[PDB]
Structure formats: C-alpha cells, structure tokens
Amino acid sequence: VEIPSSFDSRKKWPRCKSIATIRDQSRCGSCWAFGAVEAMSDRSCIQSGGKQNVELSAVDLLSCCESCGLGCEGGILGPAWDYWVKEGIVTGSSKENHAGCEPYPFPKCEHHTKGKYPPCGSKIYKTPRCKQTCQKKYKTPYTQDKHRGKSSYNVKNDEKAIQKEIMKYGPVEAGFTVYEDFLNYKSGIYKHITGETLGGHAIRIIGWGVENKAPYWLIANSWNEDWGENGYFRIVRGRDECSIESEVTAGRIN
Numbered sequence: 001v002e003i004p005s006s007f008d009s010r011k012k013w014p015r016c017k018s019i020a021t022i023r024d025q026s027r028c029g030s031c032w033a034f035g036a037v038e039a040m041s042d043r044s045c046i047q048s049g050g051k052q053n054v055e056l057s058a059v060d061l062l063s064c065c066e067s068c069g070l071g072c073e074g075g076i077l078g079p080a081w082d083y084w085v086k087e088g089i090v091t092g093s094s095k096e097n098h099a100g101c102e103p104y105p106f107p108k109c110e111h112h113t114k115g116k117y118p119p120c121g122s123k124i125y126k127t128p129r130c131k132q133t134c135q136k137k138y139k140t141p142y143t144q145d146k147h148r149g150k151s152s153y154n155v156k157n158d159e160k161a162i163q164k165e166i167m168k169y170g171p172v173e174a175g176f177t178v179y180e181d182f183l184n185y186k187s188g189i190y191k192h193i194t195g196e197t198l199g200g201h202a203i204r205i206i207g208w209g210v211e212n213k214a215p216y217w218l219i220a221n222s223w224n225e226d227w228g229e230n231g232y233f234r235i236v237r238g239r240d241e242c243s244i245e246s247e248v249t250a251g252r253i254n
C-alpha cells in the first residue's frame with residue numbers, strides 16, 4: 001500500500017472517540033500505562049468495528065501488572081502489552097468522569113505549563129494498590145469487564161514500518177528520551193536543542209504530517225488538553241529524534 005504524505009488516525013476512524021481523547025497521568029509516572037491503555041482502547045474500537053468501544057482503565061494496568069516495573073516510578077512497554085493479552089484490562093475513566101469499573105484515582109494537574117488546573121508540582125503519589133474490584137455503582141463483575149488483546153509486539157525501528165503499522169491497525173505506543181527542553185514545549189515541531197537527559201516518556205503516536213516540508217509525528221500526550229497543542233505534540237520524524245522510532249510497541253485484538 002502507498003504511504004500518504006500525511007495521516008491522522010482520528011480522520012480514518014472518527015467513530016472511535018478514544019482516538020481524540022487526551023488523558024492526564026496526574027502526579028504519577030504512569031505514562032507507560034497511559035500510552036498502552038489509550039492505544040489499546042483505540043485499537044479495540046478500530047479492530048472490532050465498534051463492538052468494543054471502551055475506555056480502558058489506566059489504574060488496573062498500573063496497579064496490577066507485576067512484571068511492568070515500578071508503577072508510578074516508571075514502567076516497561078512490552079510487559080504492559082503482554083499483560084493486556086494475558087490478563088486483560090477492565091474499563092475506567094478519569095477521576096472526574098468517575099465511570100467504568102476502575103476510574104483513575106488521581107486528579108488533573110498542569111505538567112510544567114499554564115492552565116486552569118493546579119500545578120502538578122514535585123510530589124509523586126504512591127502506586128495505587130491492586131484492588132481487582134469495580135467501583136460500587138459499576139455493576140458488571142470485574143472479571144467480566146476484562147478486555148484482552150490477542151497478540152503484542154515490538155514494531156521495527158523504521159519510519160515506513162511504523163507508518164504502515166499505524167495506518168493498518170491504529171495508534172501505537174512509543175518511548176522517547178526526555179531532555180530538559182521538552183518540559184518547556186508549547187507548540188511546533190519538537191526536537192532536542194538544549195538541556196540534559198532527564199528520563200523517558202511513553203506516549204501514543206496517532207499519525208504524521210509535514211509543515212513547510214519538515215516531517216513530523218503527531219503524538220497524543222497524557223498531560224491533559226492544556227499542555228502543548230491541545231494536548232498533542234509534534235516531533236521530528238525519520239531521524240530517530242530522542243529515540244522516538246526505537247521503542248514502538250503495539251498489539252491486536254484479533
């Protein structure tokens with residue numbers, strides 16, 4: 001199939017509201033779990049033809065996966081997708097929406113940026129306990145509410161492979177290196193110019209494009225809609241910028 005110069009998963013599958021959803025990790029290094037459950041929500045809607053249109057629970061994955069790392073202190077992308085395949089993940093919304101089996105326990109906050117929510121600040125919440133019980137008003141049994149993948153995999157470190165993967169099966173999760181200057185992103189096509197290495201971040205790549213011939217990936221962040229470009233950012237595409245093409249992970253429901 002031919003690779004178009006631009007592609008946006010929202011435009012290909014507008015019936016799948018999750019693709020346009022911007023989540024908030026709050027004061028927790030749960031990015032690894034957010035990029036996973038977000039892409040899994042998108043893919044479940046895409047690949048099921050809408051029979052599974054759910055918002056999967058970040059807290060179920062964050063709190064219960066034992067092979068996924070350190071919870072709010074950082075996690076591992078491959079095992080997150082394997083957990084979805086082997087154990088499954090229940091439904092759950094933001095704290096503010098208080099919907100689904102296991103809604104997120106932590107409130108929206110601003111991630112080194114201006115807006116109406118309280119600043120996230122420096123403190124990191126303790127990883128929630130693995131409870132495996134739905135909220136009181138949610139009447140579907142926890143075990144019955146589990147949504148499972150069929151397979152998971154790493155995507156090849158190759159721009160065209162990543163493009164084809166997205167177009168065919170939907171958004172992917174990806175890891176990239178956070179340098180200091182990323183925390184001051186407001187708009188544009190990000191690349192590392194200044195600042196030392198801080199750590200890594202895990203996000204959802206939903207498409208790609210070009211601006212004045214400069215290629216980029218279109219990424220949904222998990223720092224709420226006030227951050228960046230309405231919750232999204234763009235980053236240089238095709239030069240493994242901040243290792244953005246090096247840790248791409250996804251999976252399928254069928």
Ligand SMILES: *[C@H](CS(=O)(=O)NOCc1ccccc1)[C@H](CCc1ccccc1)NC(=O)[C@H](Cc1ccccc1)NC(=O)N1CCN(C)CC1
Nearest residue numbers: 029031032069073074075076175176178198199200201202
């Ligand atoms: C999610 C990133 S974030 O919380 O939104 N913060 O943005 C990056 C940042 C900024 C300042 C300092 C450090 C990082 C989390 C943050 C985890 C964390 C780091 C430092 C202090 C508290 C919490 N990042 C991860 O979960 C990353 C994901 C990733 C994997 C591979 C390649 C790129 C990204 N993974 C980790 O941080 N892990 C991996 C597993 N080990 C066992 C723990 C650390």
